[PDB]
Structure formats: C-alpha cells, structure tokens
C-alpha cells in the first residue's frame, strides 16, 4: 500500500504509530533503511524506549538505521543528520490535544 499509492494519489510523508509491537527487533529496523533510495521522499515513524541518546539503540538498531534520533521524558535530539544538534521546547494544551509554539 506504499509503492502503488506512490504512483496513484500522492505520498510525500509516510506516517506511522509506535514501534515495539508492529509484527526480535534489531531485524526490522533496517527494513526502513533500504527504501530511502527507492521511493525518494522523507519517511517518519514512532517508537518506544529519559531523555538520553542510546536508549532506542537498545530497542532495535535505530541510531544507525534511522538517522535523526529524538527523545522524550524539550526534545533532546542530541544526535541528528538532517539538522544540527538541538532540542525543541514544546508544551501541550492538556485538553484540546494541541502542540504549541513556545
């Protein structure tokens, strides 16, 4: 539903929910690594592991099969290959389910 939907409707951003179940794990981490030269356009994902750096390096392969590595406990993205090292201070509405520009 990805390569036939690529040449049919659109596809510029693939959007997924969390990782550690969608069926050990260091196996399929690379499966999303071989596409980046095949369909050509940014891919996105969600995962599960404070807010360190080599924690999703334990829940798969991730830090070598998925470039930018963001975290949650201020997104301590202390390792990234699309932008420079930073951390995106984000608050929440707490009812209206909205993310806000600080």
């Amino acid at each position: 539903k990805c390569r036939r939907l690529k040449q049919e409707s659109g596809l510029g951003m693939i959007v997924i929910d969390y990782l550690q179940l969608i069926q050990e794990v260091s196996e399929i981490s690379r499966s999303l690594k071989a596409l980046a030269r095949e369909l050509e356009v940014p891919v996105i994902a969600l995962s599960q592991l404070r807010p360190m750096m080599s924690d999703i390096r334990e829940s798969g392969s991730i830090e070598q099969d998925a470039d930018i590595v963001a975290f949650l406990y201020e997104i301590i993205i202390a390792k990234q290959r699309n932008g420079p090292v930073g951390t995106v201070q984000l608050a929440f509405i707490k009812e209206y389910n909205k993310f806000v520009n600080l």
Partner: protein, 121 residues
C-alpha cells in the same frame, strides 16, 4: 593521603583509595542521581588530577555523557543547557567546561549491554 584520591573531601576521608588492586562499588535507587555521583569520582581523576580514565559507560552513551559535567564544574544546567546557545553572562561558561572536557581522561565508551569481552583488551 598515601595515595590516590577519591575526589570528594569527605570520601577521600576514610579511604585514601581507590587503589590499583580493588573493586569499588557505590549505588542509588530509582531517581537519586547514580552516575551523577560517579562522574565526580572520575571528573577530578581526569580534568584536574591528571590520570587517564576510559568511561566504558554501560548506561549512557558518548553523545549524552558530555552534559552532566558541562553542568558540574561550570554551573550551566538550568539555562537550559539541554539545547541551543548562550547569554552575555553564559557565552563563555563553557570555555572551561567544554574547554575542560578533553584536557582530561575522557574517551567514553557508549554501547549498551556488552559482555566483559570488548572492555578489557
């Protein structure tokens, strides 16, 4: 003092080592700051007291261990220094905090659940 130090004044107290033939153990509970304490048995024995130490950190990596002692002898852990740039009072609080982070025994090991093998050799 005989002796090889510990770092703290009231921990170099009853020991004076921390010597080249003994295994030393110190641990905390869920959220008491555990390596936050280990840093300072090594921070001294790296930056100031000049001895080479290889932090083969089982927990933390090597692209994360940097901050907790950019924050220690530097006082820049509220700015916040989890991100970004600096102030007209913080521009160079790191000229000797990340200026004092390689003139030391600092060659960190980052990898997760390793066996005893890729450590000793």
């Amino acid at each position: 003092i005989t002796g090889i130090p510990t770092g703290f004044t009231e921990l170099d107290r009853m020991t004076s080592g921390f010597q080249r033939s003994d295994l030393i153990i110190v641990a905390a509970r869920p959220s008491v700051g555990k390596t936050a304490f280990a840093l300072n048995i090594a921070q001294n024995v790296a930056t100031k007291t000049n001895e080479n130490v290889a932090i083969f950190s089982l927990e933390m990596s090597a692209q994360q261990l940097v901050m907790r002692m950019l924050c220690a002898e530097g006082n820049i852990n509220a700015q916040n220094l989890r991100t970004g740039k600096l102030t007209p009072e913080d521009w160079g609080k790191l000229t000797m905090a990340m200026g004092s982070l390689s003139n030391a025994g600092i060659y960190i090991d980052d990898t997760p659940s390793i066996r005893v093998s890729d450590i000793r050799a």
